[PDB]
Design an enzyme around this catalytic site. Sequence first.
Site, PDB file in Angstrom:
ATOM      1  N   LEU A  32      15.440 -16.819  71.773  1.00  0.00           N
ATOM      2  CA  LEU A  32      15.132 -15.397  71.647  1.00  0.00           C
ATOM      3  C   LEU A  32      16.379 -14.689  71.134  1.00  0.00           C
ATOM      4  O   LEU A  32      17.371 -15.327  70.761  1.00  0.00           O
ATOM      5  CB  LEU A  32      14.671 -14.776  72.970  1.00  0.00           C
ATOM      6  CG  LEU A  32      13.280 -15.054  73.550  1.00  0.00           C
ATOM      7  CD1 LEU A  32      13.261 -16.361  74.316  1.00  0.00           C
ATOM      8  CD2 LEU A  32      12.798 -13.901  74.419  1.00  0.00           C
ATOM      9  N   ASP A  33      16.318 -13.363  71.105  1.00  0.00           N
ATOM     10  CA  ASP A  33      17.492 -12.526  70.925  1.00  0.00           C
ATOM     11  C   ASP A  33      18.040 -12.184  72.304  1.00  0.00           C
ATOM     12  O   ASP A  33      17.342 -12.332  73.311  1.00  0.00           O
ATOM     13  CB  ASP A  33      17.131 -11.255  70.144  1.00  0.00           C
ATOM     14  CG  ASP A  33      18.350 -10.508  69.618  1.00  0.00           C
ATOM     15  OD1 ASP A  33      19.487 -10.956  69.873  1.00  0.00           O
ATOM     16  OD2 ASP A  33      18.171  -9.469  68.948  1.00  0.00           O
ATOM     17  N   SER A  34      19.304 -11.748  72.346  1.00  0.00           N
ATOM     18  CA  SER A  34      19.925 -11.364  73.610  1.00  0.00           C
ATOM     19  C   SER A  34      19.281 -10.121  74.202  1.00  0.00           C
ATOM     20  O   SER A  34      19.298  -9.928  75.420  1.00  0.00           O
ATOM     21  CB  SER A  34      21.419 -11.127  73.405  1.00  0.00           C
ATOM     22  OG  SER A  34      21.634  -9.994  72.585  1.00  0.00           O
ATOM     23  N   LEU A  35      18.714  -9.268  73.355  1.00  0.00           N
ATOM     24  CA  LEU A  35      18.071  -8.056  73.841  1.00  0.00           C
ATOM     25  C   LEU A  35      16.665  -8.343  74.359  1.00  0.00           C
ATOM     26  O   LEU A  35      16.196  -7.692  75.297  1.00  0.00           O
ATOM     27  CB  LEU A  35      18.029  -7.019  72.721  1.00  0.00           C
ATOM     28  CG  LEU A  35      17.439  -5.643  73.027  1.00  0.00           C
ATOM     29  CD1 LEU A  35      18.329  -4.860  73.971  1.00  0.00           C
ATOM     30  CD2 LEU A  35      17.177  -4.881  71.747  1.00  0.00           C
TER      31      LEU A  35
END
Lengths: 114, 112, 96, 80, 54
Positions: D37-40
């Site tokens: 995923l993305d970190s956000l």
Amino acid sequence: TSVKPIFSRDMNEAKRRVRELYRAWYREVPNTVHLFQLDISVKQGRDKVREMFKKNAHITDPRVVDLLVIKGKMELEETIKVWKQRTHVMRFFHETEAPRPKDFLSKFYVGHDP
Amino acid sequence: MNLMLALLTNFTLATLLVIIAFWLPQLNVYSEKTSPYECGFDPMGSARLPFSMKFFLVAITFLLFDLEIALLLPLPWASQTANLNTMLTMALFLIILLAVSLAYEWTQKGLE
Amino acid sequence: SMVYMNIMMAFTVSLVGLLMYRSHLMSSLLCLEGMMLSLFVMAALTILNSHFTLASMMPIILLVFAACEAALGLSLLVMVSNTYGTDYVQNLNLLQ
Amino acid sequence: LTLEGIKDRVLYVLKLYDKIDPEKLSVNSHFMKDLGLDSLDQVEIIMAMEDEFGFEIPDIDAEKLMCPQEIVDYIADKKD
Amino acid sequence: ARQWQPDVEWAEQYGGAVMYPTKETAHWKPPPWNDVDPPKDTLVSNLTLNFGPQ
């Protein structure tokens, strides 16, 4: 760098602070959609927020990220309450403004080098 | 038999003029933007009607002072009478019985 | 005559299912004050044709308590909404 | 109060998000090293537990979970 | 000591909610040892009038 910070120290309290207020805005999308009597779909208001936080991810420095926090912290005063009369919120959604070409050949017909 | 035709004239002339203003010259089918406006010169009031204590005691206090003026009401009919020492000394009682009910409540009214 | 049957049919504004039920308890205290004038009138029709000359002070005194009675009952119905905000007769905590 | 009933709730959350994860109801999705995923984007996933099964998400644990194994285990000592 | 059986369980079987004798039913509530004030919920955010461009 001889200057005291605002809130954070180095890269960790900052990048947990920015993840804090995202959970505020994610909660406070489906409230304003009826608190102002505005008729769109609710998933539009969540798309704009996850669009907006990815914009600033080129930063390699603390207390610049902390400056964006203060702007992001402030807007939850006006938005969660009723201080914007339906019009200051809807400016993020450029409905009126005509589309820009953004490709080379369409600029060349109309406009002297924008 | 006119009492009772002394007022049914007055109400059918009353309801005449309101429907020749609210109805007839009215019917706003054109643009008539009834959108979210018309909110009584304001916006959305997400709060309901809150209780106000100092505007409840004004209702009850009046009601208990309103009763014993109807006891006090047949004083002019209590003039052409028999024994009148009774009639005077009883008429003075109710007024004092109304007056004490002030002075007890008068030590605590509030910002009315 | 028929002026007593109506109104003795109109005494059934108690009707007990609608004397404490259902919720918005103000609807039930309504017919408690509206059960008067089925007693204030039903007395007044009887004292007046049959010239008693003295008992007609009793319909005057019939209002004076029932006003003060219902005013007391209306004081407590603020106290159920002072603690809640809604009267709602399906509030029940103290069992029996 | 059932240890399996909280394994129910964690394992229909993830595909109900229409984004990245393609029906992978494994416990070994390790979220930006196994799944990806993305970190956000993980920060959204933790927030669903307030209205689904009921929860608080108190503290820095959301920076720590990183797999639905650890999501169940912190719910495990939370309730039973 | 010896005298009789004044055991602990005779207090909990008489333990005061409803005295379920021959069955268990929808009990009431472990009634309050102090005077009876659980439901304390009395608050409102007061009226937000703007006497502005009025």
